[PDB]
Write a protein that binds this ligand. Sequence first.
Ligand SMILES: CCOc1ccc(C(C)=O)cc1-c1cccc(N2CCCC(F)(F)C2)c1
Length: 116
Amino acid sequence: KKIFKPEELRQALMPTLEALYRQDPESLPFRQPVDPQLLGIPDYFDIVKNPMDLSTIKRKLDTGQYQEPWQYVDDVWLMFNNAWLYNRKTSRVYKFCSKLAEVFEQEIDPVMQSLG
Ligand SMILES: CCOc1ccc(C(C)=O)cc1-c1cccc(N2CCCC(F)(F)C2)c1
């Protein structure tokens, strides 16, 4: 049973998160937690029960909250699923989410092979 050290996870997985941050404009809606009052979308927390964003994932990596790589992947996918659930298919946020999911799939695969 492989035990992953926090710095091993940070060194392997942080570059995949940085690849999402580097997408501009597509990462802009995801860099900070959704603020429904500021954005004028007060129904947000009625629809999205478990919010997630890039800055929260980065903090979890920096503070050793993930014991296994799949837990990090689950949080990235939670962020994507929240955006596809909440936003309309024609919206900027939905299409930007779809682009981030393509980028993430490409970056995470070789990294998971290396962590095996
Ligand atoms: C359109 C209502 O804002 C949102 C709705 C939903 C969600 C989620 C993640 O479900 C996010 C945002 C959000 C948050 C910050 C910035 C931005 N943007 C600023 C730059 C231009 C832009 F990238 F197109 C959009 C969008």
